[PDB]
Amino acid sequence: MQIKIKYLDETQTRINKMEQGDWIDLRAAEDVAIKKDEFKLVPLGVAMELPEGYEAHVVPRSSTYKNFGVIQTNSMGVIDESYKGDNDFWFFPAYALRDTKIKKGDRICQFRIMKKMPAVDLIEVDRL
Amino acid sequence: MQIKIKYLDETQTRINQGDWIDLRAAEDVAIKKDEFKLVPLGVAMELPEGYEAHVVPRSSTYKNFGVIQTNSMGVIDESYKGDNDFWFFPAYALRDTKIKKGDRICQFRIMKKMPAVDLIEVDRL
Amino acid sequence: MQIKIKYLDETQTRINKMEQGDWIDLRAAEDVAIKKDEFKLVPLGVAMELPEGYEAHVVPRSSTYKNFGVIQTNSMGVIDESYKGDNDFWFFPAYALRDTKIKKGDRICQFRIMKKMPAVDLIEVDRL
Ligand SMILES: O=c1ccn([C@H]2C[C@H](O)[C@@H](COP(=O)(O)OP(=O)(O)O)O2)c(=O)[nH]1
Numbered sequence: 001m002q003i004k005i006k007y008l009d010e011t012q013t014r015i016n017k018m019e020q021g022d023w024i025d026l027r028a029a030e031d032v033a034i035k036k037d038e039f040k041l042v043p044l045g046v047a048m049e050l051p052e053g054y055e056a057h058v059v060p061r062s063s064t065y066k067n068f069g070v071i072q073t074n075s076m077g078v079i080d081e082s083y084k085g086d087n088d089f090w091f092f093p094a095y096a097l098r099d100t101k102i103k104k105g106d107r108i109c110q111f112r113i114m115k116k117m118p119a120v121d122l123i124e125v126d127r128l
Numbered sequence: 129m130q131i132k133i134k135y136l137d138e139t140q141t142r143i144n145q146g147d148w149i150d151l152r153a154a155e156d157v158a159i160k161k162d163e164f165k166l167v168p169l170g171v172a173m174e175l176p177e178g179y180e181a182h183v184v185p186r187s188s189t190y191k192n193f194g195v196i197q198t199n200s201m202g203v204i205d206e207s208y209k210g211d212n213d214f215w216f217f218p219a220y221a222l223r224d225t226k227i228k229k230g231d232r233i234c235q236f237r238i239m240k241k242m243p244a245v246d247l248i249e250v251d252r253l
Numbered sequence: 254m255q256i257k258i259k260y261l262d263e264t265q266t267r268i269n270k271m272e273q274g275d276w277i278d279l280r281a282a283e284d285v286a287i288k289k290d291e292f293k294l295v296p297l298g299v300a301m302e303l304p305e306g307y308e309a310h311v312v313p314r315s316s317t318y319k320n321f322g323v324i325q326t327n328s329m330g331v332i333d334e335s336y337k338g339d340n341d342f343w344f345f346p347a348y349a350l351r352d353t354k355i356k357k358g359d360r361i362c363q364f365r366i367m368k369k370m371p372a373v374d375l376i377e378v379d380r381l
């Protein structure tokens with residue numbers, strides 16, 4: 001199956017090929033400084049069309065906290081197959097636990113795709 | 129396949145493919161900066177056999193409410209299916225905040241449970 | 254399908270799993286004290302060889318916040334099949350929101366396996 005990827009501009013680092021199944025590192029599109037106890041949506045400089053029936057999950061890297069002192073505010077980001085527009089760029093929602101500087105090109109998070117959940121009928125009941 | 133849902137009361141907003149599903153606050157919940165509260169979602173559910181639920185914030189949850197989910201991602205097992213097994217969102221407030229009854233606060237999907245696997249102890253890898 | 258598990262030493266409480274595919278709790282390998290607003294990588298005292306083509310995901314137990322006042326700084330840890338060396342021990346990255354103590358043996362996080370994402374073609378495009 002395939003992913004189509006548009007970059008914000010020619011200066012964004014092209015990302016890893018995916019012929020092995022490993023999660024794929026995504027990078028800051030520009031310098032971002034965040035003060036302690038402040039929040040920033042860090043641009044990742046990438047828009048994607050994911051295979052039909054799939055979604056992507058985004059979490060921080062293992063060394064993200066050590067190096068940058070940030071947590072991801074939504075825990076795990078979900079990118080649906082439908083977020084496939086030419087302006088549908090990806091962002092890492094960063095809350096800083098300490099004063100920090102993130103530089104353009106720094107790897108800041110990682111993503112993989114997964115099959116979206118199957119067809120389900122929700123049915124209300126009065127008692128389990 | 130089917131999920132059976134019981135709602136806490138008649139006032140809870142009935143929920144609603146493949147997309148993750150929005151869950152909502154069952155009552156008003158005020159949380160001060162640096163304080164924690166379990167936010168009731170006013171739903172109990174009987175998931176399909178051999179499936180579990182995963183619960184994460186919505187993308188806009190932090191912008192709108194200034195809360196983070198303290199367990200990162202909640203796992204609701206197939207076996208949490210009793211009549212009193214209502215779901216909760218564990219919220220830590222990074223600023224003073226006010227959640228209102230009915231506000232969408234998190235979202236869930238189901239996923240097949242891990243395969244049968246045997247843990248074997250070895251003294252070296 | 255199996256997982257090979259090596260323990261740090263004899264004093265580590267062996268980890269049992271449920272026949273059903275429940276997530277599996279892991280424990281702290283030693284007594285760890287963490288101050289408010291400090292970070293510690295909490296050793297779990299286990300190294301594992303996961304089945305081929307699988308990865309593990311590590312999240313906190315629902316009760317970890319209430320019992321120990323810590324969040325997991327990477328949201329959800331990804332353990333690849335490749336992290337199967339004799340000194341590839343697993344850790345829970347903990348940030349304390351209050352002064353806390355975690356005891357040796359305490360069940361603090363939980364894991365399951367999942368198949369790795371399938372081989373996919375990343376293909377750059379000028380517009381979506
Ligand atoms: O974010 C979550 C996570 C879990 N639960 C439900 C399912 C869970 O079984 C119960 C509380 O479980 P527990 O007995 O505290 O521990 P365990 O998670 O091993 O069941 O709450 C939630 O409502 N929200």
Ligand SMILES: O=c1ccn([C@H]2C[C@H](O)[C@@H](COP(=O)(O)OP(=O)(O)O)O2)c(=O)[nH]1
Binds near residue numbers: 311342
């Ligand atoms: O929550 C976690 C996340 C990962 N690891 C392990 C697996 C990982 O391989 C190693 C850190 O190595 P890395 O090379 O910084 O990251 P990765 O292997 O994720 O690229 O720590 C943990 O013990 N706990």
